[PDB]
């Protein structure tokens, strides 16, 4: 389906960027347009942490106090006054999208400043991290573009400096996450393997998914970045748009 028809059918804005990492072929649509990136930021931060911690060191522990807790911390809220491992922090953040867990990761890395440093190093001068679920077309805070984010994903993970173990760990989590079942995973041919990280912001029907798509017998992923929003602040997102976009796109591959 034309991408235009999908914007028409859902009365929404779509931003797409796909890269078949084997051939280098690219599919783009509103690729330099800015959208909230928000919670999809989790995969980036965990990824950064994996660059500095060998797999064999994920069992190191950090203390959790009351001052650590942030809203929507399904897992971490139970750790008050205890020690948790780096590995469990990656897990709570990627599988349960735990807020405290993401915040601990960032600190561990050395703060937002250091993440900002790593981004520039990779060639990303677009993505603007926040020191998350908020979006306003006014600002460039918490935004990236499909092309930019797509370039970062590839450089960070698909072809980054991760170990096989670290890469595997992280990919396993994005593979097994039930919170993306309605997105890119709903859209692609059943033979495909999809490791994704969803996102959303509470304003403008800001709904995204990012993935590493592995076609039938192909070892190299297609990086797919889909960013959607709407015209009203209180608009509600429809997950089918993403499903529908993914399906459309996979066809060019």
From Swiss-Prot:
This is Beta-lactamase. Substrate binds at residues 197-199. The keyword Chaperone does not apply. Keywords: Antibiotic resistance, Hydrolase, Plasmid, Signal, Transposable element. It catalyses: a beta-lactam + H2O = a substituted beta-amino acid. The class A beta-lactamase family has a specific amino-acid numbering system, sometimes called Ambler or ABL numbering and often misspelt as Amber. A multiple sequence alignment was used to derive a consensus sequence and then the consensus was numbered taking into account insertions and deletions. This allows use of identical numbers, e.g. for active site residues, despite differences in protein length. UniProt always uses natural numbering of residues, hence there appear to be differences in numbering between this entry and some papers. PROSITE patterns: BETA_LACTAMASE_A, PROKAR_LIPOPROTEIN. Gene3D superfamilies: DD-peptidase/beta-lactamase superfamily (3.40.710.10). It is an enzyme of class 3 (hydrolase). It holds the Pfam family Beta-lactamase2. GO terms for biological process: beta-lactam antibiotic catabolic process; response to antibiotic. GO terms for molecular function: beta-lactamase activity. The active site is at residue 39. Its EC number is 3.5.2.6. Belongs to the class-A beta-lactamase family.
């Amino acid at each position: 389906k034309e991408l235009n028809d999908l914007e028409k059918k859902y009365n929404a804005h779509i931003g797409v960027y796909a890269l078949d990492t084997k051939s280098g072929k690219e599919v783009k649509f509103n690729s330099d347009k800015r959208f909230a990136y928000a919670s999809t930021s989790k995969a980036i931060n965990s990824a950064i942490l994996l660059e500095q911690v060998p797999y064999n060191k994920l069992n190191k522990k950090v203390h959790i106090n009351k001052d650590d807790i942030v809203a929507y911390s399904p897992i971490l809220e139970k750790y008050v006054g205890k020690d948790i491992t780096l590995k469990a922090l990656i897990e709570a953040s990627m599988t349960y999208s735990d807020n405290t867990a993401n915040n601990k990761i960032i600190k561990e890395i050395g703060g937002i400043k250091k993440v900002k440093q790593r981004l520039k190093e990779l060639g990303d001068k677009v993505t603007n991290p926040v020191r998350l679920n908020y979006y306003s077309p006014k600002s460039k805070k918490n935004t990236s573009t499909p092309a930019a984010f797509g370039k970062t994903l590839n450089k960070l993970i698909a072809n980054g400096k991760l170990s096989k173990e670290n890469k595997k760990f992280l990919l396993d989590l994005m593979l097994n996450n039930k919170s993306g079942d309605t997105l890119i995973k709903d859209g692609v041919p059943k033979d495909y393997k999809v490791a994704d990280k969803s996102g959303q912001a509470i304003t403008y029907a800001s709904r995204n998914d990012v993935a590493f798509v592995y076609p039938k017998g192909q070892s190299e992923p297609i990086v797919l970045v889909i960013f959607t929003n709407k015209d009203n602040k209180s608009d509600k997102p429809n997950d089918k748009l993403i499903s529908e976009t993914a399906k459309s796109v996979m066809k060019e591959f």
